[PDB]
Symmetry: D2
Subunit: 131 residues, 4 copies
């Protein structure tokens, strides 16, 4: 699975976005160790605090299906450069993804940036901290 295919999935996932309030659509595609792909998109709500992001939707669909081993995650939005995952999403990524998972960031014009789960949120807060 070369990142380009996963990116293609994230771009399709982005079209399923329910973002009538921000008008900002985000798509994500998660690749399991066994090669299965899970798509995700942001889903908004009139009461802003309830909004769920693309990265999390993809991860939560996988986990709720029994898939917890991942190798790559692609995220795409219509930004000048590769889209930047928000802090909350990086946190969820650091919790559900091993530190070696590859995070592929992109947009709708071919700009790509890659980084590991660790580099995305260095020294992330974790279950270990809770002693």
């Amino acid at each position: 699975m070369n990142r380009q295919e996963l990116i293609t999935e994230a771009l399709k996932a982005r079209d399923m976005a329910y973002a009538p309030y921000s008008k900002f659509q985000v798509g994500a595609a998660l690749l399991t160790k066994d090669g299965k792909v899970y798509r995700g998109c942001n889903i908004e709500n009139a009461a802003y605090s309830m909004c769920n992001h693309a990265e999390q939707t993809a991860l939560f669909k996988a986990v709720s299906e029994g898939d917890t081993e991942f190798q790559m995650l692609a995220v795409a939005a219509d930004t000048p450069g590769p889209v930047s995952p928000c802090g909350a999403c990086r946190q969820v990524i650091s919790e559900l993804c091993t530190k070696d998972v590859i995070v592929v960031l992109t947009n709708l014009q071919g700009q790509i940036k890659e980084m590991t789960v660790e580099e995305l949120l260095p020294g992330a807060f974790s279950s270990e901290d809770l002693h």
Copy 2:
């Protein structure tokens, strides 16, 4: 698809729960107008505010797949009586479900309580209030 079958789906969904911090597992099963079922469970995080709930997981899974028409949602947890959806979930339910969708609440001992969206969240805040 009877409600008793949906309940069994929610119970199965509950086993996929990732609740290592609260140790409280919740499951949910959403039924589309076309008879398709989407399972959901709660997925926690070391940083508590990140946690996603079973009801929301099922709905987000459905919506991210293109299914936006629903008829029934079942929720189950190991509580004294039927499990009670939290306020945040009721809000997401009132936004993504039509006012007629049937919400089936239950537990691990056959106790069942049924109700509609409006009854679940009286005069819910909505997109209408944003003009």
Copy 3:
């Protein structure tokens, strides 16, 4: 302090709102049993899921100061009728407020609707269920 005076505080609190994304400002004023008032407003973020609501701001401000016994909460927004608290806020209210606390809902034109935590959120999920 009557509800009219608490409402005056919620309306002032509303002006502190940081809602550049939705342009929808909400204010709230919480009255403790000892008569102290805590103001709250919604504070938004470019990443939508981080948004904090007025009702919650007022409640969190109070609790983080050591005040945990309340008697009344007022909420105001620019809606045609009294503003309706969202489900997440109703949940936080049911957890931090006793079932008797009076919830005063209003807008910017004098319309007022009053109600209890229980009718605000029917058989709310609670710590008992854990």
Copy 4:
């Protein structure tokens, strides 16, 4: 009001923490440019998603009071090394704090780690992207 004094504030703020579910208390102290200090702590809820964190209570209290100019933020928890702000909080920090605000992380052992807002969350998602 040097940093050691802000750290003390965050430590006191930590005692106000309402964390009956995780038993993990966190405190934070925000210093405005005018020298005013705002305390924050984490406040949990039976329904885990509602939980508010210490860093966010302090910033929300400040903003809801009209203070939006800050210079330093201290955060403390009972961890082996300085406490690490979660991603959600770093996001809120990057939105409400200027890139030059100093973030002071510590624990109960005097171990201190300092860093800037930009360093805490490099190339953070922002309003410009919308």
